Symmetry: C3
Subunit: 72 residues, 3 copies
Amino acid sequence: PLIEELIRRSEEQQRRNEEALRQLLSGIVQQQNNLLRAIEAQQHLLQLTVWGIKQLQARILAVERYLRDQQE
Amino acid sequence: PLIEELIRRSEEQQRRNEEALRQLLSGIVQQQNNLLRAIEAQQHLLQLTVWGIKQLQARILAVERYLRDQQE
Amino acid sequence: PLIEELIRRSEEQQRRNEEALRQLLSGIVQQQNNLLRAIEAQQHLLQLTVWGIKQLQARILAVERYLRDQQE
């Protein structure tokens, strides 16, 4: 799963920015790229679920119609 | 799709913060608002899919029950 | 809903970073942790919907097969 890789990568960069808080600006900027990539990967997965739900809707509808048509 | 607009808007702001790294703090702060907006828009879409899945669950359940009831 | 709590928490931290823009670096770093947590919580919910969709797929498939088998 890429998203968990981008999340682990962001968790590392977070610890480094916090430790460095205790190089920083560049690390904050990189971390913003990590988060943006995660959001983008999540958006891709979300789009897939939306299409999957539409597919299931069509399949259920076909079954409901079949059962209506069998009653005649 | 708003989310792809907020993602494009974040991708631009990322390039600018990276180029400016090579105005910065304000750009990092704005980029944080872009990412927050994207997460919020994704949350809205995610909530819709959760409700869509519940609707499909109810529709399948009604069909399963109909088929059980037809067996009598 | 945790995600709306993490989103409210991020919205507060955003206003503070913007007001402070008008303490900042630490607030930007903390806000990055807020956003990362939101993305992670969203990922958890997204994974649940993926599994829910698979469950519905199996349920619809069982009904489609039952109806095929009844035709004999």
